[PDB]
Amino acid sequence: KNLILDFPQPSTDYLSFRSHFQKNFVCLENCSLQERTVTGTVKVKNVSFEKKVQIRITFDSWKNYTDVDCVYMKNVYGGTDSDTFSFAIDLPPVIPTEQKIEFCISYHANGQVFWDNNDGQNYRIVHVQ
Ligand SMILES: OC[C@H]1O[C@@H]2O[C@H]3[C@H](O)[C@@H](O)[C@@H](O[C@H]4[C@H](O)[C@@H](O)[C@@H](O[C@H]5[C@H](O)[C@@H](O)[C@@H](O[C@H]6[C@H](O)[C@@H](O)[C@@H](O[C@H]7[C@H](O)[C@@H](O)[C@@H](O[C@H]8[C@H](O)[C@@H](O)[C@@H](O[C@H]1[C@H](O)[C@H]2O)O[C@@H]8CO)O[C@@H]7CO)O[C@@H]6CO)O[C@@H]5CO)O[C@@H]4CO)O[C@@H]3CO
Ligand code: NA
């Protein structure tokens, strides 16, 4: 593939997921690349009924960015402490090697704003030869 995720999927590293989720109230859960689409899920702490969960993504080293709405997905077996939101983002026909593709996650609820920015580095998608 000419594109890989430059980070481990948090759902495969539960101890790291749990720490970040408890601290930030939002954390990326799944992320995968298939056929120039990036898809995944986000877990949020259930602090209010109405929620706005977005991926903020750049394809040009933050010269510009797009906010993409995530969609609530009820788990029939889920609890009430957290909620899961999905996203699906089509990638550009070609992506840069000289610029960076990076994203982070925002969560608006209860008059508060929470973010997952991967410890200040954002989540990077890198090119492969
Ligand atoms: O019935 C009481 C309820 O009535 C009013 O709410 C109605 C609202 O005004 C309508 O617009 C519509 O809701 C739509 C909504 O406006 C849209 O934005 C969208 O909603 C999405 C959410 O934004 C998104 O967060 C997610 O929602 C899921 C939650 O994430 C998840 O946690 C769970 O929600 C449960 C709450 O966590 C829990 O607290 C409890 O909610 C109570 C509220 O806290 C309380 O304020 C009151 O709610 C009023 C509301 O204020 C009125 O405006 O009572 C609630 C019940 O006790 O229970 C929640 C449900 O289990 O689940 C939700 C998904 O159901 O996804 C949604 C969907 O995309 O779409 C909404 C639906 O069209 O209808 C509601 C009434 O149903
Ligand atoms: Na919403």
Author numbering: 132 to 260
Article, verbatim:
Dephosphorylation of both enzymes is exerted by protein phosphatase 1 (PP1), a pleiotropic phosphatase involved in the regulation of cell growth and protein synthesis, other than glycogen metabolism. PP1 is directed to its different pathway-specific substrates by scaffold proteins; PPP1R3 are those orienting PP1 towards GYSs and PYGs. PPP1R3C (317 amino acids), also named protein targeting to glycogen (PTG), is ubiquitously expressed. PTG is composed of 317 amino acids with a structured central region, containing a carbohydrate-binding module 21 (CBM21, residues 133–261), flanked by largely disordered regions.
We determined the crystal structure of the PTG CBM21 in complex with β-cyclodextrin in two different space groups at 1.5 and 2.0 Å resolution. The domain is organized in a β-sandwich of eight antiparallel strands (β2-β9) divided into two β-sheets, with an overall immunoglobulin-like fold. On one side of the sandwich, the N-terminal region forms a short 310 helix immediately followed by an α-helix and connects to the C-terminal segment through an additional two strands short β-sheet (N-ter β1 and C-ter β10). The four chains (one in the orthorhombic crystal and three in the asymmetric unit of the monoclinic system) are identical with an average rmsd of 0.36 Å (over Cα atoms). In the PTG CBM21 crystal structure, the β-cyclodextrin molecule binds at the interface between symmetry-related copies occupying site I in one chain and site II in the other. In site I, half of the cyclodextrin molecule lies on the shallow tray generated by the β4-β5-β8-β9 sheet together with the β4-β5 and the β9-β10 loops. Major van der Waals contacts are with Arg187, Trp193, Tyr196, Cys235, and Trp246 together with H-bonds directed to Arg187, Asn248, and Asn253 side chains. At site II, the cyclic oligosaccharide inserts in between the β3-β4 and the β6-β7 loops with a close net of H-bonds connecting it to PTG residues Asn177, Phe180, Glu181, Lys182, Asp214, and Tyr203 (this last being water-mediated); additionally, extensive van der Waals contacts are present with Lys182, Tyr203 and especially Phe180 that, inserting in the cyclodextrin ring, becomes fully buried. The observed interaction at site I configures then as a crystallographic interface or as an ancillary carbohydrate-interacting site, which binding to glucose chains is cooperatively reinforced by the dominant interaction at site II; while site I shows some sequence divergence, all site II residues are conserved in PTG, GM and GL. Analogously, we measured a KD of 59 ± 5 μM with a 1:1 stoichiometry by ITC titration of PTG CBM21 with β-cyclodextrin.
